[PDB]
Design a protein around this ligand. Sequence first.
Ligand code: A1ACR
Ligand code: A1ACR
Ligand code: CL
Ligand code: CL
Lengths: 122, 122, 4, 4
Amino acid sequence: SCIQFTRHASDVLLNLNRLRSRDILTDVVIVVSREQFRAHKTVLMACSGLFYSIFTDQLKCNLSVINLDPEINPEGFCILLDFMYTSRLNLREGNIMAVMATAMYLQMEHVVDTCRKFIKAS
Amino acid sequence: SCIQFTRHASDVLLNLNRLRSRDILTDVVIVVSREQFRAHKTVLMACSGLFYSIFTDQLKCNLSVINLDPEINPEGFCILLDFMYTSRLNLREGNIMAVMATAMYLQMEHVVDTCRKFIKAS
Amino acid sequence: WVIP
Amino acid sequence: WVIP
Ligand SMILES: O=C1Cc2cc(Nc3cc(Cl)ncc3Cl)ccc2N1
Ligand SMILES: O=C1Cc2cc(Nc3cc(Cl)ncc3Cl)ccc2N1
Ligand SMILES: [Cl-]
Ligand SMILES: [Cl-]
């Protein structure tokens, strides 16, 4: 018999993104080639099958630095990290291939699905 | 020119609640009288003006245990902690007074608003 | 607020 | 997915 506040989840994600922008309570650095991205492990896990697996590992759960596969493009990762914290995906003709490849590696099934759809249309 | 995934924020919150239920990456214990509640500091901050203030404090940000005011009712806190992680509020005749008082203390303005509305109706 |  |  609960009541529900429709905007609650969006407001929570908006505040988590504000914490990220201000580097508050970030607990991991994701290294992608020469580029570094600070984030919250819980948000990464909630969005990505790969980070979910990494941070549930009894040894990796305690690492403050995670290095991605050298094939991963820093821009594709940046676009996906922004999507994790906002629900908004900056999908463009010039980045769609790198975004799909990065989403497949990160195991972000809904992003992979829209990339496959957008590629099929063109 | 971003696209948006409508269910993303709700799915993120659902996964954060799954992490809470399994006690994964929880980093704080909230003590309410004899009762203890494990949670993620970032989620508490995203939902509550009080936890936002506590965990942005340069000394309190590093505490693993937070003791609430002894007037705070453990059931009212439990109902609010569930709301933080689900958007669902178990508001009942028998708990509404304790829920409003706890939401006022935690600085959860939308919960305070619905409690004031529900009390006014009766 | 809604009835979910 | 939508146009926000
Ligand atoms: O496309 C995706 C997105 C995703 C997110 C998560 N994260 C969780 C899943 C569960 Cl069941 N509980 C907790 C978490 Cl944090 C796992 C796999 C995938 N695949
Ligand atoms: O009723 C409420 C709910 C709430 C949440 C937060 N948390 C934040 C606010 C900002 Cl601007 N950035 C980041 C965070 Cl985590 C503060 C005050 C209140 N009052
Ligand atoms: Cl996704
Ligand atoms: Cl609220």
